[PDB]
């Protein structure tokens, strides 16, 4: 380009070529799970009377 644009492109480049900063990204996924089933049940069977 023209020397006037060359000097303009030279500033654009210098700004655009800036050392891009780095990022360390730690994620922390914590899950906790449990629960209580309970099955208690009573059955009575009698020949004479009847059963449940």
């Amino acid at each position: 380009a023209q020397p006037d644009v060359m000097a303009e492109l030279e500033q654009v480049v210098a700004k655009l070529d800036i050392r891009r900063a780095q990022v360390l990204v730690e994620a922390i996924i914590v899950e906790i799970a449990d629960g209580d089933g309970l099955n208690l049940g009573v059955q009575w069977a009698n020949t004479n009377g009847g059963g449940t």
């Binding site: 655009l16 800036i18 891009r20």
Partner: peptide, 27 residues
């Protein structure tokens, strides 16, 4: 990249966005 589209309306002046340094070059 997203800002380029926004500004393109305002212009529509000559724009591009550098995906790397995430900078906008307008003239």
């Amino acid at each position: 990249k997203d800002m380029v589209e926004v500004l393109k309306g305002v212009s529509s002046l000559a724009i591009s966005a550098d995906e790397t340094t995430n900078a906008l070059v307008i003239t």
